[PDB]
Amino acid sequence: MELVLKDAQSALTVSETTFGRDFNEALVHQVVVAYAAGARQGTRAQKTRAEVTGSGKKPWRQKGTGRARSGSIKSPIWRSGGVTFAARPQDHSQKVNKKMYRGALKSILSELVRQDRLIVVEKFSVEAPKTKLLAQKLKDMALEDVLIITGELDENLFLAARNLHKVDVRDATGIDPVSLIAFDKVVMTADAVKQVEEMLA
């Protein structure tokens, strides 16, 4: 298993199961849904018949009147107040096993090299935080919408990719499934591969 670079063709080898396992679609889908579910804020609340600002007085008599039987004006079948099963601020994040999360990331990375979307390079660093020269850089290697992942997160590259919409800079420990899927291409520097190999194992 060899990861060939773009220019110097220095042959880097990694573990077999990390970048060559079968693509378990069910395993990936659960983690992707769970990652989206954990980003849900879940800040919402309606009012029940016990929380609507109003009186607990019976509107009219139980019998005698020709009207329907009513006990409170806050009833959900009434106007100006209702909602029987009112929502509460809840948590939508769901638990993911360590081996399931790591197993899904290895299957995601294994499909990336099968779709030749993973481009490994020896180094990735800009001399100045200017976004013009960063936009000059990836255009020469014919990339427009990529995920810039490096082993060491430098502020010189963090500032240059802050304004460009289609690129994102992250730290090697801070990888997630959804950005490895949403972005078209993903680029590796040399030392990030050796750091993501051991964190997945």
């Binding site: 009219w60 008599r61 005698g64 009147t65 020709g66």
Partner: peptide, 15 residues
């Protein structure tokens, strides 16, 4: 909106 005087009740019997 007011109700009604209700129909005048008849003298109730017993066993």
């Amino acid at each position: 909106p007011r109700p009604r005087p209700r129909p005048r009740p008849r003298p109730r019997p017993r066993p």
